[model samples]
Target chain A: EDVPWFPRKISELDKCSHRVLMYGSELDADHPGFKDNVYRQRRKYFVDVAMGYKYGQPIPRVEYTEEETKTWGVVFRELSKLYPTHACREYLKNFPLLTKYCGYREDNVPQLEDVSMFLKERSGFTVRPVAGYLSPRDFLAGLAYRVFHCTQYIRHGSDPLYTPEPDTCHELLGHVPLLADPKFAQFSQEIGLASLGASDEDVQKLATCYFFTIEFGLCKQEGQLRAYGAGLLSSIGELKHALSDKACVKAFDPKTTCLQECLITTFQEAYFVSESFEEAKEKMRDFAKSITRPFSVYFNPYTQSIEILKDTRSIENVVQDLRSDLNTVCDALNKMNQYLGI
Target chain B: EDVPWFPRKISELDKCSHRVLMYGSELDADHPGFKDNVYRQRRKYFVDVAMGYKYGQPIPRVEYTEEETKTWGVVFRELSKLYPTHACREYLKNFPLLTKYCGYREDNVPQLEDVSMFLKERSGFTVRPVAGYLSPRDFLAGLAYRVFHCTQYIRHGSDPLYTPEPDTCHELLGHVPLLADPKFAQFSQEIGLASLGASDEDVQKLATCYFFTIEFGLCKQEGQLRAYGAGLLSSIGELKHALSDKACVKAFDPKTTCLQECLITTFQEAYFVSESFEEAKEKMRDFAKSITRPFSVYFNPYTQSIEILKDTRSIENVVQDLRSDLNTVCDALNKMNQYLGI
Candidate 1:
């Protein structure tokens, strides 16, 4: 019931929204009541943020349970050790900024507000707390407005190094650092924009694009494959396994990567390699155009809202200008006729 | 594009309807135009039938091109050799019916009408010619009315043994024989019924079930794993590969089988097994009910039509039945009132 992973979110999205956190007892069978209470309290934080129950309400500050904070500390210290050697330069460069602003440390668990403000300053992007995982449509739509639907709970204490489902460690360590990069932020928003008014078929393609590029993607750095994808950067096992020769690595072309299967449960059999994040974003432009979602999305940074457009403003402006020019020509013709005494 | 099979259909179903045939010529670069024409003509027969261009029209008959007939002859003779030893008892039993009614000879290609009639007589199933591949939704809905959406083209002559796509040989020799069995027919129809109003998520689960059991399934016969799956029965390469010790064979449980990843464009690493067709059918019935389709389906034998139901029975019949039942209740109440001198 606590479908922990992101790929499961894509497939089993519609079945439940709130249920992702409601079934925390199922995650740890021995401590049902305690785990249930903890998850429910944490889930309330996300639900409150999503509903925007009060107008212009700030994101709730999580007084994370003691065990939960410990869980975050365990994965944070373990995963941070691998980031220098395994993480792409983009992630590595911003890792320290995340520590300074977002409280990325062994002892203190970073609050969503710290990370949201940090991302907002960098790329007009902010994180919104979600009860747990959101549906594919709900999740992607958030990206169009430069808002991230994120969870605040830490994983169960039993699995310290890894949790099948995403926790704060996976989100903050795996995703936040990359979000600080402007190029990656723009790329993420493009995928979100395509999902606006997209059919189920088109939504799935955009999700697959998200899965490969944002979740398990890699980049070529200094003639070597380095990790940038959140799934790899967050997990010590995956980071090591993905970069080693044991895994099959292919050159990342958006044409090929968008088509790659997103395997959620196990280590991926193959990883696609991008020459650079910039090239990855460039190749995606044509593929994104091919989505055929009926509308276009525009983000207003000042208002912090997304506008869905059937036809663009340039076309409307051109049509109005043509009409004005036609009227001008008609007046000149009428004057010429008067002068001729016709 | 590494479009891993089933989900790939969801994304790429539109780009190529008839193109699956055109690519057959590309398989052998030396002879393109001649093979291309043969497939094009075969595809036309399918397209014409799909249009139902004339109301109440007969299923279009294919005038098999010379090379197409020859291609059928090669696979027919080759596959028939292995049927006696490799194919399951259900397929072996109905093989003769196909030979007699559908013109299953090495020198002749079978007409879809002939096969349709044969299936109709035995199990209330009929074959309908499709331009090429149908989307998962379109293909599965056909089965709800006991209709199979089938392709009409033969494989290229260059590779008599294999064609990457599903050709006539795969549809007829691999699929048709099993459709004649009552239990297998019921199992397949159950899957179709589930798809009628099911969400894309549930349809995918059912499709995965269909893929494992119908496309690449296996069963136990006298303690030995025998091939019942259409994929293995049609291919020389896959059949040998699947039957060998190299492939991992697991006991067929719907719980696991439906979740198994179908490896398309390659031999499956694992195959699920069942003790008997009856057992498979019984298990599938439970799985079918589990699908969260909002509606039910009904089939009219006389009209050869499918009805999607919120409630069944005609409005006239429903009103009349309600009226008759109300009168009987009223009569009983009147008698009771008289006895009490009211």
Candidate 2:
């Protein structure tokens, strides 16, 4: 028997704190910045923003220092150069828009407010800043409402080459672009949706699928492999290594990929590749059907809440929104028809 | 005691025929085209398209004669001249777009295909050709799914000033524009949503609301009355007659408006005026809340069907769409933010 420590609604996510399931004292001593009280305190400042976040409020802004900006600049310039050649279409298409709208650039360290707003406008995904890492249980719960608990502190400036955990660049450079993509957003949210109220084993399988597909997935582009995973795209060293002859790339299947285990240091030796995001989504959708839940959970955007599909008015309320959405689409289609000569 | 013979699903609408509840072989004797046997046969040809229509198929096109085109032109030109000053903003704003996209002009009568396509593109609303008049139960059910049963045959050329029953010009000119307005669309669909599965008495109340708000509705704009009703907008005679000192216009109250005895000849002797479309919609939404039902019904745009919202997955499916719609809005907001210098 299993109990849900997971959030059932968007509001419950506020209580599923990012504090450790283990010791809560401080960062691991092995962390590059673990020795520096100054950097650790700065990490604390950013985490406080996460601690303060609740649903519906504007994502609190975090101001970055010149050094933090420089640190971001290093990651930005380095990772971006590989993007044109190796990034998937989903990631590539959203970057310029991210640059223009979210102030995504080498010199500027974009605020969570701008990036969160940009992503919200782009894909119904919002970035909620987190102080430290979260368990798969807590993390995926955020995704249920299309909220991504983003770690805001830059990885130790001592080594922009790698991060022990998700940092500013890994999230912004690697994750944010694809998160803005609707297909990828859909894929991400579906994983979150499936994980909610599932048994532990089912949740574990769902999280592993998230790991394989979202964090380290690759796919064929024109023919050669292109990286869409945050873990690959965020790290300059890993991006090159994953596409090289050294990595053991396997076709992504939720079943098989969930069983494969290899964190192989800061870089990975094995990666899962899908034919494309669409195919990846279809496969995941099929896999999700294999999971079980007594009641289906639905998140309502207008109210920023989740509802179990049980009651009468709740269902009708959702239908009304759908009808409204249909109207919006028709309006757009009409414009397209008029100007585009349909 | 009352019972609903109305359609609950979009598919059921196919069975609620334009054929009479009584002996229904032909048109009323006073119908302008009833004396003309050739025109009557032409009318039957167009009616067959409605009877043949299914839920998802393309709206069958109805080709027209020069005589029909000429009559449409007369109605189009005469009614449009009044629109600039007297039409609701919701109606006025969409006129040129309809003119451009639907071929709304004096010389050419647009096909139901173009007009239906235009309305479907502009609003979630689609036009289904009806051979003859539908009872309030049947007609409002079409609205439940954002559909409008449009009569495709033009009124007889003997009189472009009025129509005994709804004609092509009345549908295209009077109803199509408001059906395409989001605020107006919301108002109309809410009426339909409330009418669905209601007791006959409740449905009659809803139908009366429809008659006042959709057919002979008036609203104040810039301190003067603007016509939004199909009956008022389509008929040059009624449009002028409804606005003049002779017709008594009352403040629109779903309670009082539903009670007023209507149909004083072709022109309404009494009209209901709301302050604005928003006010009218809000009042109607509130009025709908006063109506009771044991279960709530939801229409899914993706499936093009209706559900009672009783099952888990069905509710979840509707929720999924709202989430998808949220993504779409975020996308548009992103675009607007990018170019609009946000």
Candidate 3:
């Protein structure tokens, strides 16, 4: 089906890299071939600019050795006092980007070029807008090309304790920085796109890795715990809670992670971790493939009933019947609404 | 407990024709003289004004012939078509006080004086500001004196549907108009005060009538339906729906009506009806004399927890404790907010 408002023109498509154009048509079916379809609706454009993607560095670093640097340090320290525990303030230093994404620092945040520069210098990827939730296949594609997905807005201050919604920080901090790491980033992109082709069960298996790494993944370096998942690192309160042993902690496994029901809007009750980024990347590379298939093989009426196609009646007669049925149903609905007077 | 800023001073009451000041106290079991304490903590004020009442009127003595009035009828029909429906038009045709209390011309639309005039005619009723949801005892007292509680506002042209999160229409239509009917008006005022002396269960039982009659009630004459409830009569959508058989209808009974859950911000499913206004007035009057206690019995513990009261001993002391607790919570919250660094 041609979803409405799709980018049909090449000019429009080139300008909007995030735009998607789906293709699946058959002339023998009631639906005409894509080339011959009379009413080809264009789906609306979705944004691209990937968060947590590449960013360029400043040509000449903005001079902040004296006042601004000292001021930011002092602010970070004050912020630490309020946080109630020692944890990552590295991302807090990226507050300027958070503000810009939230629309508060429209004129103040670093330029897109600066972000691009950092990506080129440090990471292998750049940002791109995605239409919607991508399967593992699209994920691999973006990862292979070094592109990320981003939402356009920033989180407002009112939603501090628990956002109950994703915001810029979760995207920019949790995933993109890791994309700078060749192994981790490449593996993530591969996992994302690969899951697309996987059976539902296989995708669920891969999701365990995603939840641990992308959603609630954690890192332990030199006998010290550090936050990795964007959900925790972005949330100051949850970050402190995660550090406490009193908080619920559970062991992770690939199979269980895949099957686990996770809540994305709130803090996770579980987390995933690897001994090291190398061990993490290595374990997942050419990872054991999930042995499953979508029940479509058994349940797909189309393939199972493909013989019905050979027994088809005249196309012209079928079309006439459909047109008559459409008019009858519409007229009945109109009468009902009229009588109700709504 | 002072839930919110309510019960404005008598001086601050709206400009209306009638009002009442009653004697009462605000003592709780935790007060200094708890066991033998006379519950006299308030000298509250209520308002009553005769409004929206009707009486029989004779037919015109020197009636013009049908031909003589033809031009006038034609003009009215044309004008009505052009300006079909508005607050002024509906109010003119429907208000019970149109001629009896407000002295408004039946031919022309309502004016501001109509409201004031109706209030002036009422016996023991006037308008007063209420904070939000009122305590049953206090509301009953207001009703007993034909006192109509009204928040200060006016329904403007821009507000066509009359959104019910308290605007002038809800106040003026629900309470003010009924105050003109000497019987119904007095019944309300008496009911308002009756709750003060009753037990919690008794107050709740009596609240049944208040819920159905005050919030969403209907009246039928012969085979024609007439709306008495402000929730219905004031809004076009609710009015039409209430009369439709598709809506859930029930006979008027005090207990059931009170227990019936009313959906706010949407159309009501149930309604109450009386055999006659006189029956409602007489029944309520008898009920009012046997005053009961509040329905929602438990006092708000937010500012008046027994522990804090024991620790402080004075109202001022309790206030200070509350203030300090509030401040501490706020400071901690602020600290957590900075941790977000958004």
Candidate 1's displacement at residue B291, Å, is: 58
Listed per candidate, the RMSD to the true structure in angstroms reads: 20.3, 24.2, 27.3
Q: In order, what fnat does every candidate score?
A: 0.00, 0.00, 0.00
Comparing only chain A of model 3 with the true chain A, what is the TM-score?
0.53
Error of 2 at B270 (Å): 80
**lDDT tens digits, residues A177-295, model 3?**
45555555655645543443345566566766776666666666556666656666556667776766776654333544667777755667676654455545544543533333221
| Interface RMSD for candidates 1 onward, in order | 33.8, 16.6, 31.7
The local lDDT score (0 to 100) that residue B313 gets in candidate 1 is 31
lDDT of 3 by residue, B1-342 (tens): 322221222322122212323212222344332343221211111111112211122111222223213322333343233222322222334354444554333243223334544564554444444323445545554443344554332222233354444434455544455555655554554454455446666667666677677656666555445566665645656766777768777656453465666576677767777655655666565555445322212112242111212111233343444555655555554555557632
* Candidate 1: stretches off by over 4 Å: A1-55, A307-313, A316-342, B1-342
* Per-candidate TM-score against the hidden true structure: 0.43, 0.47, 0.30
The CAPRI category of model 2 is incorrect
Global fold similarity of model 2 (TM-score)? 0.47
Q: Pick the candidate with the highest TM-score.
A: 2
- The candidate scoring highest on lDDT is 2
Query: How does candidate 1 score on lDDT?
Result: 0.70
The C-alpha local distance difference test score for the whole of candidate 2 amounts to: 0.77
Q: Indicate the docking level reached by candidate 3.
A: incorrect
